[PDB]
Amino acid sequence: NVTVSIPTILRPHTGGQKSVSASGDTLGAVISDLEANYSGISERLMDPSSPGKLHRFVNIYVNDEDVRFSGGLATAIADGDSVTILPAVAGG
């Protein structure tokens, strides 16, 4: 089980909740689990033109580390990890 921080822009998918539980042993597994509980959320994370890749303007971090440098959706996830989702804002 992991704790996922949901940015304001995606909270209409999570009933307004800013933080939700998810399970999975990779980022892709957590995204799958999120989709099971929060319909439509995964499509918002993924590139509509390059399926299988994250949206250019979405950043995701597992225990504060950017998944683009740790295997992307294959990034390993362990029980107790934090997952942070943020839109791309210069300086943030």
Binding site: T8, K18, F57, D66, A88, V89, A90, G91, G92
Partner: protein, 325 residues
Amino acid sequence: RHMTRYDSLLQALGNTPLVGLQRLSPRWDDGRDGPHVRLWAKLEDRNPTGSIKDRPAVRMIEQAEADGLLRPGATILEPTSGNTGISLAMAARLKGYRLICVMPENTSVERRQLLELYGAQIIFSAAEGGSNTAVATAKELAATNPSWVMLYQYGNPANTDSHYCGTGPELLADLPEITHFVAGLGTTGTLMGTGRFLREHVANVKIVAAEPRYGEGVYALRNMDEGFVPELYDPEILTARYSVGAVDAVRRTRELVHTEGIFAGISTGAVLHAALGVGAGALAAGERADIALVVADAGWKYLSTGAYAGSLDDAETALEGQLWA
């Protein structure tokens, strides 16, 4: 380099000190338990206006002057989160240019005090979207007023050039043993120019970004398409990228001044947090490391935020609505 008398403040730009952090380093000397893992702080607050941004601001202005874009009485327009605008305000005051900065409203009061002192106009942009909103507002104004000069730090290769020709060479001259470079990530100029220089000149060097994580409101765009990645950015230069929240950044900023006597801005605390992670990794692996990290500015412009007083929790509440790099 190696000079102490200069004919003007702008001539003294750069050539900043590199200072070892003997107490914070995971291991200062080689021991029976394995090789050293040293942190070295590059003090970019020892620049004309007190931040690293003096380097790209001077380079951008001088490139534009060389290009013939800037002549006496010209108007410069720039979106900024404070430091670039302060550096440009100083250079514009001395060179006789007018400066209009577009800056998010949730920036520290010290930034607007300095901009007003140097005679720059400030256009405050809304806090939601952070620098994305200031950039969008500036681009609209530039398009409407084509005679103004928008140097545009998020796309102008003179930003990166300033680091490829300044920060990078100076670091390598002082630290030929360098294994890692850690810095913040805003325009991406520091890591793209310093990191390209280092990757080209130093076998096996690793380049690490330490990105602030702001409160939720900063990221509250209305559409994912309002997202923005600076045109300077090339993810191939980085080895890793860390997102550091306010409590960790504030903790490490306080640790740095308590332990090493260096009074740095909050982005430095995010850098230090990343660098200590990288350091812990090298120590666990029994690998020698010499990790240089940027102190982009001093603590002075953040004193009004409250973050340097009170309990470590609540510095967090103090910074929730605010930008801090």
